[PDB]
Design a protein around this ligand. Structure first.
Ligand SMILES: CCCCCCCC[C@H](C)C(=O)SCCNC(=O)CCNC(=O)[C@H](O)C(C)(C)COP(=O)(O)OP(=O)(O)OC[C@@H]1O[C@@H](n2cnc3c(N)ncnc32)[C@H](O)[C@@H]1OP(=O)(O)O
Ligand SMILES: CCCCCCCC[C@H](C)C(=O)SCCNC(=O)CCNC(=O)[C@H](O)C(C)(C)COP(=O)(O)OP(=O)(O)OC[C@@H]1O[C@@H](n2cnc3c(N)ncnc32)[C@H](O)[C@@H]1OP(=O)(O)O
Lengths: 359, 359
């Protein structure tokens, strides 16, 4: 099995969102990932590419046989991932304390939104709820309109699965000293707050306000935003540094002497109107050409469907093809122990066959 | 130093955005992190709270002495982080190969937007550019308007710093069984693509379109969006599962029989109009109360400055007071080897002092 996490063994209690995303990535990087799902719900080989790099098994954990098979897998494994509400694995017989008795080397990884304790810890929720409570959602969107969710990128993945991964892997490094595992408490409300640490930093020093759409990186700055082109498609402009901004102006045909200063915020309305008219005068692909190989920080805003035609995406093999859709190749990349193409979802496997293989 | 990464040694070549964020999290979890900045820019004690849990040193990497000193640090370290454009560390003579001469164990971590090679590899960029090329930016915002950047959470951090971290820690695991370091190539355009794997999976199975504002999780669904309240503040609604959706309807005062189906997408506009009027009839805190302890998936949308006053936030200590204001405490959390509160940014110490300390 290719990749730097070769040999690493993982048990995943099937759930939704961050849990499986973390499990995917471990698998992506070479880990041996085994996923226990309900029989209650499996109808052949899965169509969810998020379940790649997996062996799937079925098991009613409510039954006593279920429980004990599961407990055998765990005993032979380096990591457990579960993302149910607090108390669920306890009441199944699969809690940290019950796991610590069949394998004190276990990394016990708990993926929630709200955390393991406190008033909201039993409330159902999704991405949008967790980022609503810690200031993030309020900051996203135009100023004249209600906040807009950044899909489920910030709570589920950036501030969720990825902090679960850091926790698992940080704990594996600890386990090299002490010889013992431990419990990783990954909550989306905490992870996403560390994910946005920069704004908390800038806020402290007066470089960020609570007003939506009036900051350097939220769309309020005319040099960090998208612009509609002549064809109704878009470019992105990220020309923060004055040298890059100058390069942008020259490619737009605008003379700096006729525009307000880049960072004169009181004249951002004028500046925006000027840039808006210039970008509107040609189509996205024109600007893409004009600015390729420049430091102007102007790129075309591509739709998912067009990504596979972009030279730089093609050439670094950022995507692979599989079942009527492209999918991302593993990230990041390793010089010596490279990951390989992900193995698709495979039909289910008997939990015995796995206990055998793991010997 | 408290945390699972006690006695990991990390050398950070100073940059902006992802590299410092990764370095911060490593520090947060108890790593020994030394940041080499240029003397050109160090004036006082640094007021960027992202520079917490660091020792700062200066060193002209272009002088002979600066280079030699840096290479002695790197020889005594486990991980090196650099976030310059490709070729830059090579020309300083701090490239992977020079580092492997003084330390075949080093994890060499390279943080870029576009990657190490390919047509855009030398192009300046920021977050908004990286996410423009791979379909992410196009998918965020309302459908009747131009895309809106989700701050710099998705390229710099979620698809950026966090993938650098998963790369550093997976390589440390691989090292324990091979004796050898390697090079981690973390490109924001790759990481952010994996971060958004759920949408690629969903588009593959016909459950996501390239139309902005027309999807389950992009704000197009009336049960997954924000709503403005009587006071001009907002709630977030995330009631995907029908039973959570039904609980929300009951709390709004809405008889399910008069509404269109939850998931009849052709009637979503009509459904949104009915929910809009309901939510508009009371203020945000009213709904926060009504739905406390509920599975309705309804939460108040808090601005940064309100977050310190929310019970679930206080009681889990997600933030600590510092500096000007609040900062996120480390994430995720560890049962046995727990992180401690971050140390505020050092004063510049001398690179020899560090060297004698590390001997
Ligand atoms: C249309 C559906 C698909 C929606 C797709 C959405 C994906 C993305 C979206 C934007 C997110 O943001 S995804 C993150 C949600 N939050 C969390 O994941 C954080 C923490 N977990 C939760 O809050 C809950 O899991 C959640 C609200 C997601 C679901 O609640 P639930 O349905 O009440 O499940 P809960 O976790 O409380 O417990 C269910 C358990 O099922 C039983 N048992 C598990 N595995 C097995 C098995 N193999 N065999 C038998 N039973 C199994 C447990 O016994 C338990 O049931 P019980 O409490 O009734 O005893
Ligand atoms: C917080 C404060 C303000 C932050 C403003 C924005 C914050 C967030 C924003 C939204 C982002 O998205 S941040 C991510 C940007 N992209 C990358 O980080 C991707 C990779 N790097 C780049 O593409 C470039 O670094 C970038 C475009 C960011 C800037 O280009 P550059 O200024 O030309 O720098 P480059 O990397 O090309 O090389 C600069 C180097 O400086 C010299 N030397 C470094 N350390 C030292 C030293 N200790 N002593 C002396 N000189 C030093 C290097 O020699 C090199 O210079 P050279 O090629 O002129 O020889």
């Amino acid at each position: 099995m290719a990749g730097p996490l070769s040999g690493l063994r993982v048990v995943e209690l099937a759930g939704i969102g961050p849990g499986p995303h973390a499990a995917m990535i471990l698998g992506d990087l070479g880990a041996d990932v085994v996923r226990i799902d309900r029989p209650s719900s499996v109808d052949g080989i899965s169509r969810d590419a998020m379940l790649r790099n997996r062996r799937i098994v079925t098991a009613d954990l409510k039954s006593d046989q279920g429980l004990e098979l599961a407990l055998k897998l765990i005993a032979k494994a380096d990591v457990l991932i579960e993302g149910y509400r607090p108390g669920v694995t306890e009441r199944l017989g699969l809690g940290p304390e019950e796991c610590a008795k069949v394998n004190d080397r276990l990394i016990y990884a708990r993926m929630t939104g709200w955390g393991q304790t406190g008033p909201r810890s039993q409330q159902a929720g999704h991405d949008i709820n967790y980022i609503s409570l810690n200031g993030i959602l309020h900051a996203i969107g135009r100023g004249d309109e209600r906040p807009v969710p950044p899909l489920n990128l910030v709570g589920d993945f950036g501030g969720g699965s990825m902090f679960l991964l850091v926790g698992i892997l940080a704990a594996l490094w600890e386990r090299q000293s002490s010889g013992k595992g431990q419990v990783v408490d990954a909550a989306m409300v905490d992870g996403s707050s560390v994910l946005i640490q920069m704004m908390w930093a800038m806020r402290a020093t007066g470089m960020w306000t609570d007003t939506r759409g009036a900051n350097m990186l939220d769309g309020g700055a005319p040099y960090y935003d998208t612009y509609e082109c002549a064809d109704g498609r878009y470019v992105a402009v990220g020309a923060i540094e004055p040298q890059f901004y100058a390069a942008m102006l020259a490619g737009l045909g605008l003379d700096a002497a006729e525009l307000p200063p880049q960072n004169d915020r009181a004249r951002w309305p004028e500046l925006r109107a000027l840039l808006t008219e210039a970008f509107a005068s040609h189509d996205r692909d024109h600007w893409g050409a004009v600015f390729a190989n420049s430091d102007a920080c102007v790129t075309p805003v591509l739709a998912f469907g067009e990504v596979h035609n972009e030279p730089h995406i093609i050439e670094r093999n950022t995507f692979y093809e599989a079942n009527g859709g492209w999918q991302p190749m593993p990230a990041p990349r390793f010089s010596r122990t490279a990951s390989s193409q992900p193995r698709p979802p495979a039909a289910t496997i008997d939990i015995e066959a796995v206990l055998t293989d793991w010997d």
